[PDB]
Write a protein that binds this ligand. Structure first.
Ligand SMILES: *[C@H]1O[C@H](CO)[C@@H](O[C@@H]2O[C@@H](C)[C@H](O)[C@@H](O)[C@H]2O)[C@H](O)[C@@H]1O[C@H]1O[C@H](C(=O)O)[C@@H](O[C@@H]2OC[C@@H](O[C@@H]3O[C@@H](C)[C@@H](O[C@@H]4O[C@H](CO)[C@@H](O)[C@H](O)[C@H]4O)[C@@H](O[C@H]4O[C@H](CO)[C@H](O)[C@H](O)[C@H]4O)[C@@H]3OC)[C@H](O)[C@H]2O)[C@H](O)[C@H]1O
Ligand SMILES: CC(=O)N[C@@H]1[C@@H](O[C@@H]2O[C@H](C(=O)O)[C@@H](O[C@@H]3O[C@H](CO)[C@H](OS(=O)(=O)O)[C@H](O[C@@H]4OC(C(=O)O)=C[C@H](O)[C@H]4O)[C@H]3NC(C)=O)[C@H](O)[C@H]2O)[C@@H](OS(=O)(=O)O)[C@@H](CO)O[C@H]1O
Length: 481
């Protein structure tokens, strides 16, 4: 039914049956506490949407909880929030918290909501430990987040100082066609998306066709902290950070675009920890790279095997293209001094990247940047395997013989890569095709009903005066008195 007030919405949501449709009349729903515990069924979801997307606003001290299964939340604009700062925490439920499986949040706008620290959307475990699976977050816009924690957290374990061989279960969520543009916070402040927490966690989440444009929240654009997540066809434009395989072996990144097109800040880029990954057909063209990380497009982590800062080794880096990167194309030992400290403290064995299969990559430069293509201060003949790559435009920086014949360049055919269970993508086919398409634009991911890109940061790298004042207050209360 159509509802026009918080009270009537609360009532209809308690009565709605599978296949039901709840439509919210044009208006502002201030301090709305939407809790949906009922469930739809496969083929008969329950849909809660704005009757006219773009005309419904959830504001004030609001909260949405999707506890039932087979629910769809659509066309809501979240703004002008006012949740209690003493009542929300990073690592807790998001403004929208998804506790049930088979749920979808689509075509929603989250714009500088408020000053309470938390994610904008989370999949969250219920108190009895049940983990939501098979959810989808798509065609949503997340802009000007001025609070700590990631924009989205996909959880399969409760936060804990951890380290027991037990890990969270596979989630099988998908985050697609979302837009992310958010300002830089200080320190380990929470980035764009976090999936899982530690290496024993299994993710199997698909993150595809998203546009991160000045997603600058913190060092990590995405901190992928679980095994077997697949990142396909995402565009990272002028982002002050790197997309990371932080924890969890056997992760996949195929055909993503990492573009930096001005000199305003250092951009990224990928920082990789762990082994057995598949990093293929990605395109890196970065006008400026990140000094603090080591000035590179692809950073391969040195350290102790399978540790808290797991050594990057035994993986396939294929058919990628590094075009005019103003930094190293690949840095084989970033932050090595800190990693030696971590290894010494825990009495672990410090090692450097090896057993890498670098096949069919193109390294090209025709702009006056000064960086050789590679940095490997621990180079050892034969530790890595290089085949079918092409390098031209600047010295390589390491003693490896690579063809300089650009005209003869061709991505390599690969057919031995196992697909990820639960994710319908033919990795062999995609990798063998080489790099397809081009960077995604706002019109390719925007909510169907929204023409104008929201936010003040994406196009300017600066929050408007009002939002900057609120951001300043959030930052100040989170630090030392
Ligand atoms: C993420 O998305 C981006 C694009 O936004 C992709 O970007 C490309 O790749 C990047 C690497 C590059 O950077 C970029 O530049 C691009 O090159 C990126 O790869 C990712 O792709 C994934 O997401 C896509 C997305 O969601 O946009 C996926 O594409 C969709 O795939 C499904 C397609 O649907 C099928 O085709 C449509 C037209 C329907 O079929 C037609 O149905 C008509 C009516 O029945 C019929 O008359 C016609 O004969 C059919 O052809 C659809 O059918 C289904 O729906 C219809 C109703 O519309 C009926 O109900 C049917 O019963 C039902 O089956 C088809 O389903 C197979 C969709 O069009 C397409 O957009 C992509 O596959 C992902 O990999
Ligand atoms: C516990 C843990 O390992 N967590 C990791 C997390 O590691 C943390 O990374 C930060 C970082 O932002 O790099 C790091 O803090 C930085 O440490 C350096 C020294 O190594 C500087 O500290 S200082 O020596 O006291 O100055 C640095 O400060 C910056 O110094 C300089 C300069 O002189 O170059 C200029 C700057 O103005 C000043 O800010 C400091 N940065 C900050 C913001 O304080 C922590 O020590 C480190 O624990 C990350 O992993 S890692 O790969 O970056 O090492 C994170 C992934 O991004 O993952 C967590 O698990």
């Amino acid at each position: 039914q159509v509802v026009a007030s918080n009270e009537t919405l609360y009532q209809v949501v308690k009565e709605v049956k599978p296949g039901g449709l709840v439509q919210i009349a044009d208006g502002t729903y201030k301090d709305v506490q939407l809790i949906v515990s009922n469930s739809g069924k496969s083929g008969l979801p329950i849909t809660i949407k704005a009757l006219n997307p773009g005309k419904v606003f959830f504001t004030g001290d609001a909260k949405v909880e999707l506890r039932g299964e087979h629910l769809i939340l659509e066309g809501i604009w979240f703004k002008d929030g006012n949740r209690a700062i003493q009542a929300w925490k990073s690592h807790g439920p998001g403004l929208v918290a998804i506790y049930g499986s088979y749920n979808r949040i689509t075509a929603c706008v989250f714009d500088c909501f408020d000053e309470a620290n938390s994610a904008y959307i989370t999949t969250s475990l219920t108190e009895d430990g049940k983990v939501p699976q098979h959810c989808r977050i798509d065609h949503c816009s997340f802009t000007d987040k001025i609070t700590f924690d990631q924009v989205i957290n996909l959880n399969n374990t409760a936060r804990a100082i951890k380290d027991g061989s037990v890990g969270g279960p596979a989630m099988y969520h998908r985050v697609d066609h979302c837009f992310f543009s958010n300002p830089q916070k200080p320190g380990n402040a929470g980035g764009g998306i976090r999936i899982g927490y530690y290496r024993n966690d299994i993710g199997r989440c698909l993150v595809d066709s998203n546009l991160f444009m000045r997603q600058d929240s913190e060092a990590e654009i995405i901190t992928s902290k679980s095994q077997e997540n697949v990142y396909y066809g995402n565009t990272y434009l002028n982002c002050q950070g790197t997309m990371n395989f932080r924890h969890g072996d056997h992760q996949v990144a195929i055909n993503n675009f990492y573009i930096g097109n001005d000199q305003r800040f250092g951009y990224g880029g990928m920082f990789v920890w762990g082994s057995r990954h598949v990093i293929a057909c990605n395109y890196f063209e970065l006008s400026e790279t990140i000094k603090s990380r080591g000035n590179a497009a692809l950073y391969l982590n040195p350290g102790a095997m399978a540790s808290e800062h797991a050594l990057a080794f035994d993986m396939l880096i294929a058919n990628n293209a590094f075009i005019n990167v103003n930094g190293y194309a690949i840095h084989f030992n970033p932050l090595d001094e800190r990693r030696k400290e971590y290894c010494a403290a825990n009495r672990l064995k410090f090692e450097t990247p090896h057993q890498l299969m670098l096949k069919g990559n193109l390294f090209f430069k025709d702009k006056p940047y000064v960086y050789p293509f590679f940095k490997d201060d621990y180079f050892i003949a034969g530790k890595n395997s290089w085949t079918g790559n092409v390098a031209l435009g600047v010295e390589k920086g390491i003693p490896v013989n690579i063809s300089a014949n650009r005209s003869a360049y061709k991505p390599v055919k690969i057919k031995d890569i196992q697909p990820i269970e639960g994710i319908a993508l033919d990795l062999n086919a995609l990798i063998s095709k080489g790099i397809t398409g081009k960077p995604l634009s706002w019109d390719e991911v925007r909510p169907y009903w929204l023409k104008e890109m929201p936010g003040t940061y994406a196009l300017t790298a600066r929050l408007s005066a009002d939002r900057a004042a609120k951001f300043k207050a959030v930052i100040k209360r989170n630090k030392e008195h």
